[PDB]
Design a protein around this ligand. Structure first.
Ligand code: HEM
Ligand code: HEM
Ligand SMILES: Nc1cccc(CCCCNCc2cccc(OCc3ccc4ccc(N)nc4c3)c2)n1
Ligand SMILES: Nc1cccc(CCCCNCc2cccc(OCc3ccc4ccc(N)nc4c3)c2)n1
Ligand SMILES: [Zn+2]
Lengths: 413, 420
């Protein structure tokens, strides 16, 4: 069986075989598509070995050693660990291969042309939150590279019984605080108000500014999470100015240079790495500075539209569209000026099409979530919009996982 | 499973869907693969390639008539049981059956209601149905279509309408509108490789020229109608210009913009789809409404032979076109869309921006979950092609499923037509 995807702009047709090797649900059924559902839906010995066999088989396939004496001994060595300890341990080579291929397999990620150049930090000897703070600080310093950003992941110890989990409670490593005000207004980032309250409650003393870098909330071995302040010299930041509007800088805006997802789960061969913060660089449109509040009533969108003298009465003036472009121009120009890595949504989508076609040639396909590959603006004038895409779940993978404050059973009285 | 929740991640509104339990035909997805971004993911028809036996057509007929009499709170009534027997005898003796006028109107409106890709469905029950099943020639089709265009255009106060030509019998006597839309601009392939006019319509324009049409080879040449009746060779017809309402595009602030000499037509009227009711296949069913401003593809239009209207507008805007990160396509795209809305409104021609249209669709979705138990919707097509994340539908989850009656896609007639 062979499935085809067409590009309705170029007429190119790619033939997908890789989809034959997927295994877990998309969420869709034969009669319902869930393509626009965000989340649609501890291992025993008998579940774990088929999964381990799967991953090991594919790793040894990837290094042209399938069936080799080294392959069969590894499989036997894994079987013994699982039989003895109800789990097993990845070699360093397998950990690297697996983390790299989880990114390769991430169908919602447009930046995968870079997947093979991922720096993997093995943190499976970490035992304490302080060690997590040490590992994470070294990640940040390395990834940031004085603005010449570099992809990296840091992998903390895997799940055991589910009661000794390692978790980064932050959703990203660097985010700005959000405070809801008595009058209902919001200071800082509205997207982070709930996590900020958790931190304040844990004892964090909030500066109550507008761009307060949140503290790290780190959990080792299933213990209560602990607060740590990232050293400010390690948080690279870009003041936002517009190349044409000299007034734009006066909005007072900045963003952090390094995007670093820390709340997802890395699954390799049936092992779950509940803390695996990974970082790349931004596509321009991801930066949500739009949702800040300049005054007590207006968005940065509304404020930018105001200062542009836009007719903000009727929607059909497209003032919201107009201001959105300008904010994105400013974000891109600002990063580029400060020589901090960033990619515009045109450059990223074009490279993704090149990557997708090359993945079909060497790999037999490339799972892709069109709902997520298409940028949040100017969708149809980017090349992915007319690109058909097949979505399926390959493993290794990154997976969503519950927020730790909904499941953590608190230790100390 | 039992009931499927959908969530709006801006408002946290959760709707609970049970209507999907009445889904008939495959989406193309499996547990393991999703085809949500394939244009035509499935070929799961409800009946074989042409004239079907009774056991193939009647179950389809029964289900629709059942649903129609349920719709009006009969079911099991004298009229309902009598109608089933009428459809039965009719298939026994002609291998098909004929919808009542009530049945035809209900099915048309519910094929619109069920169009999971259509953001305009808030208005679904306000649809004017023109029964043209007595038509027998291309001239008759040309007359029917002409009256559709006049009624729907309504001097700019556009009204939704559908004209329904005779159903397919054996597949050899099809009625077909060979145009994809009733009004479209021609696309000429220039001997140097660039295109003049609308590049989306180059093939069809060449098909018309090949059929005897004389291209004016001007700028905005309305394509003739290529009308096929009863399976005969199709015929060319020129829509009277006074019936083709056009809006000159100017810009509210850029005065140079009108000097681009651009214009678009007011009436979008899809004419190449197939309407399917109770097993019957109406292969000629042109329908029309009014444009969402983003749909007007004037940006790809080539007046010159060097530059899109997009890159042309960017030149007049003095935009840094050196690299992409200036976002010059983004900026020009907004201005062009500002210009289009402004002109349609200035000339009193009905149009809707993508914010109002998407806001309306969320209202529609709520109603549909409140009364019907759900609403099928294709996120890949409901989200507008610009500024997606600032419209309300971006953050709305949707369930896609195929309900009948529906509008289906169908091969371009020239692939499958043998000439008399
Ligand atoms: C190197 C530059 C990268 C770029 C430009 C990039 C770009 C993007 C974008 C734009 C999204 C969509 C998220 C949104 O729209 O809010 C995304 C998703 C994602 N990316 Fe990448 N990414 C990069 C690197 C990485 C790396 C290094 C990894 C893993 C090691 C990764 C894994 C993912 C995952 C798992 C998602 C899905 C997130 C979710 O489902 O919530 N990405 N990426
Ligand atoms: C009255 C105003 C209407 C508006 C604003 C509207 C809006 C839209 C839009 C924006 C699309 C996306 C297509 C694209 O962007 O290329 C669409 C698709 C569609 N519309 Fe509506 N529409 C309207 C009326 C109607 C009517 C009256 C019918 C039929 C009775 C209809 C049936 C459809 C169908 C079947 C599709 C799917 C097209 C396909 O699969 O290619 N629409 N509509
Ligand atoms: N540079 C880089 C580098 C590495 C990783 C990334 C990706 C960061 C992803 C952060 N986690 C994204 C997210 C999670 C949950 C909700 C979100 O917003 C709500 C929402 C709702 C509906 C959507 C429909 C389509 C679509 N495409 N997005 C939607 C988002 C975002 N980036
Ligand atoms: N006012 C109104 C009123 C009634 C009806 C309409 C709709 C007019 C539709 C005309 N038929 C346009 C069309 C059909 C098929 C393909 C097209 O382009 C290719 C393409 C490829 C991938 C896509 C992915 C997502 C997406 N949303 N579109 C895609 C389009 C255009 N309008
Ligand atoms: Zn699907």
């Amino acid at each position: 069986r062979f499935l085809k995807v067409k590009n309705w702009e170029t007429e190119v047709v790619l033939t997908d075989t890789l989809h034959l090797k997927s295994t877990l649900e998309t969420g869709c059924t034969e009669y319902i598509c869930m393509g626009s559902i965000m989340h649609p839906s501890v291992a025993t010995k008998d579940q774990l070995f088929p999964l381990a066999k799967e991953f090991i088989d594919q790793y040894y396939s990837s290094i042209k050693r399938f069936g080799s004496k080294a392959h069969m001994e590894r499989l036997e060595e894994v079987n013994k660990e699982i039989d003895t300890t109800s789990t097993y341990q990845l070699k360093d080579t397998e950990l690297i291969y697996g983390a790299k291929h989880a990114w390769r397999n991430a169908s919602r990620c447009v930046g995968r042309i870079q997947w093979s150049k991922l720096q993997v930090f093995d943190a499976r000897d970490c035992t304490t939150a302080h060690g997590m703070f040490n590992y994470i600080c070294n990640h940040v310093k390395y990834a940031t590279n004085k603005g010449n950003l570099r992809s990296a992941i840091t992998i903390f110890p895997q799940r055991t019984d589910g009661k000794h989990d390692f978790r980064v409670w932050n959703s990203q490593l660097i985010r700005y605080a959000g405070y809801k005000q008595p009058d209902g207004s919001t200071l800082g980032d509205p997207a982070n108000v709930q996590f900020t309250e958790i931190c304040i409650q844990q004892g964090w003393k909030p500066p109550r500014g507008r761009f307060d870098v949140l503290p790290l909330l780190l959990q080792a071995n299933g213990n209560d999470p602990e607060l740590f302040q990232i050293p400010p010299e390690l948080v690279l930041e870009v003041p936002i100015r517009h190349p044409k509007f000299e007034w734009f800088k006066d909005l007072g805006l900045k963003w952090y240079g390094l995007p670093a997802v820390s709340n997802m789960l890395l699954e390799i061969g049936g092992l779950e790495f509940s803390a695996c913060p990974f970082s790349g660089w931004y596509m321009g449109t991801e930066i949500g500075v739009r949702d800040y509040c300049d005054n007590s009533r207006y968005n940065i969108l509304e404020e930018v539209a105001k200062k542009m003298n836009l007719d903000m009465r009727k929607t059909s003036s497209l003032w919201k569209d107009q201001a959105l472009v300008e904010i994105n121009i400013a974000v891109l120009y600002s990063f580029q000026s400060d020589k901090v890595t960033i990619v515009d949504h045109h450059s990223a989508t074009e490279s993704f099409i090149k990557h997708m076609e090359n993945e079909y040639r060497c790999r037999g396909g490339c799972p892709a979530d069109w709902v997520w590959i298409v940028p949040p603006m100017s969708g149809s004038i980017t090349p992915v919009f007319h690109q058909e895409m097949l979505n399926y779940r390959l493993t290794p993978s990154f997976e969503y996982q519950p927020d730790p404050w909904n499941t953590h059973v608190w230790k100390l009285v």
